Design an enzyme around this catalytic site. Sequence first.
Site: not given
Length: 263
Positions: A70, A109, A158, A161
Amino acid sequence: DVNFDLSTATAKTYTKFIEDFRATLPFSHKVYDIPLLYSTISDSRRFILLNLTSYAYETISVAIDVTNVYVVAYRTRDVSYFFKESPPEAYNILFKGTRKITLPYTGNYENLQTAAHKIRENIDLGLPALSSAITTLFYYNAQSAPSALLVLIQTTAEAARFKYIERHVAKYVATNFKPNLAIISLENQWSALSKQIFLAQNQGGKFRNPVDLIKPTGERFQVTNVDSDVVKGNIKLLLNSRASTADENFITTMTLLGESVVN
């Protein structure tokens, strides 16, 4: 370190970036023949930088954590900024000389969600959308800034990921389209499904705890085994999140080179 040029970004190129990206960071072990990160890797190697180029031939650097992959922070021009409660350790390895500014927001977030007053469902996405991310950061706009890097997290962090997220993001190479609830539930479930994937090794393909997520179609479905599409070629690197044994702080922290006792 990995590099991605938006000006020359292409579906085939996007694939190479994610494959090289999973290869850039180390691997604690191999799950289903795929890379993965232990609970924590070397701090000098924990932080990796990505050279991203805006469609305007401009280049910026992005720093991310190898494990969850991240973005903790990123560097623009000669100024680099990070969140709080975790990213500051960045002062130690990330930027070394360039200016430093940490926003009162935490690497969470919810903190960015409040400042941006928006949801990922209402945020635009797509290769070109990345230009807005790199472009907006250069013109750091207090309000968009938060939503700008967030797009980068969804498109770079992401995307690596899951190949599934990479596919939807790679499909758009010119138009801009908002994400979908599929990635949202899938993003949170991925963590529960990933640890269960290590468990899938002794379950013959079943999960002790079933996983509920959302298919890209736009509906909610229950997945409990590898038979599901997510466990297929859709899962590449996985988060081991393995460190419960680290409770003894010995099998870890006691690795004591003593191993290989001989000499």
